[PDB]
Amino acid sequence: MFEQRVNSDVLTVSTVNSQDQVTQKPLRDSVKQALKNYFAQLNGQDVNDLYELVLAEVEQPLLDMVMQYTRGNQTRAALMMGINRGTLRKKLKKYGMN
Amino acid sequence: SDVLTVSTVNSQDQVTQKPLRDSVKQALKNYFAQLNGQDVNDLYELVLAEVEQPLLDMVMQYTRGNQTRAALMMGINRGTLRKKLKKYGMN
DNA sequence: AAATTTGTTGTAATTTGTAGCAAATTT
DNA sequence: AAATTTGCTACAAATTACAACAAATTT
């Protein structure tokens, strides 16, 4: 049949292992490190906007990449993403994607 | 100038930071490449699911299970936070 | 010329926030 | 014992979806 591909491996950045050997690795692992570092490199100062902080860093390059793919076509990009065309528009405005 | 980043070695064994968004973008460049016109039905709920999970895990790790403390770190509401833990069943 | 997509509605469906209380847990 | 956190629970408010349409643009 077809081999399984668990949701972790659907979106993967490529890393380098103990030997000089390139290898895919789930994206969530990168989010994991970004925060391991974010906490380490912060040390004591409180934060109150971590979700929105994270959200932005993700939302932008998604929108960026989907609009690239639909060569600017908002209707289809909004279908691809599964959000309404109206909320896509609002996001893009938020991120000055215009 | 930028707070969310990830370490990257290059061919000269020099580790070096770069923003998480660059990494996200790659992920997608690659996603699309694979599918040859297979339509994507819910790409947002997918990505979001790949980002929420590890964020939930790490704040809960940081706040030592303290939901009240986490939900205030993130800027969401405890209710929401509980509801998202349910979504991925981290409970 | 035809089919699609945009920009713009008001309106309704859903999700998140608010607060407040007794019970459980940490301090 | 006192303080903090949990697991609820209406209800309010903010966000998202809907659906319609002329006008703009693409095919």
**Structure tokens given for A55:** 């959200």
CA pair distance B91, B88, nearest whole angstrom: 9
Could you say which of A11, A35, A47 has the minimum Cβ distance to residue B47?
Answer: A11
Distance from CA of B1 to the nearest CA of A (A): 13
Cα dihedral B1, B5, B10, B12 in deg (nearest 10): 60
From chain B, the residues in CB contact with A37 under 8 A are 5-7
The candidate with the shortest Cα–Cα distance to B53, out of B3, B77, B19, B89, is: B89
CA pair distance B69, B73, nearest whole angstrom: 6
* In chain B, residues 4 through 43 whose Cβ sits under 7 angstroms from any atom of nucleic acid strand C: none
| Separation in Å: D20 C1' and B42 CA | 25
Q: Are B71 and B77 in contact (CB under 8 A)?
A: yes
B67 touches strand D (CB under 7 A): yes
For A24-45, give one letter per residue: b (16+ CB within 10 A) or e: ebbbbbbbbbbbbbbeeeeeee
The candidate with the shortest Cα–Cα distance to B53, out of A23, A31, A72, is: A31
Q: Are A9 and A24 in contact (CB under 8 A)?
A: yes
Domain count, chain A: 1
Please name the residues in contact with A73: beta carbons below 8 A apart, sequence gap of 6 or more. A67
Could you say which of B25, B42, B48 has the minimum Cβ distance to residue A61?
Answer: B25
Per the DSSP assignment, residues forming a β-bridge with B6 are B18
CB contact under 8 A, A48 and B9: no
| Separation in Å: C3 C1' and A75 CA | 14
CA pair distance B74, A51, nearest whole angstrom: 5
CA pair distance B4, A6, nearest whole angstrom: 26
Could you say which of B6, B39, B62 has the minimum Cβ distance to residue A30?
Answer: B6
Range of the domain at B22: 1-91
Q: Are A64 and A72 in contact (CB under 8 A)?
A: no
Question: Which of the nucleotides in strand C have any atom less than 7 Å away from a protein CB atom?
Answer: 4-10, 16-19
For B59-76, give one letter per residue: b (16+ CB within 10 A) or e: bbebbeeebeebbbbbeb
Q: Look-up: residue for tokens 């297979």?
A: B38
Q: What CATH number does residue A70 fall under?
A: 1.10.10.60
Q: Look-up: residue for tokens 């994206």?
A: A27
Alpha helices in chain B (DSSP H): 20-34, 43-62, 67-74, 78-87
Instruction: Write the secondary structure of chain A as one string of H (helix), E (strand) and C (coil).
Output: CCCCCCHHHHCEEEEECCCCCEEEEECHHHHHHHHHHHHHHCCCCCCCCHHHHHHHHHHHHHHHHHHHHCCCCHHHHHHHHCCCHHHHHHHHHHCCCC
B13: helix, coil or strand? coil
Resolution for this experimental structure (Å): 3.1
Between the CA of residue A30 and those of A52, A84, B21, B26, B41, what are the distances in Å? Answer: 17, 28, 10, 12, 24
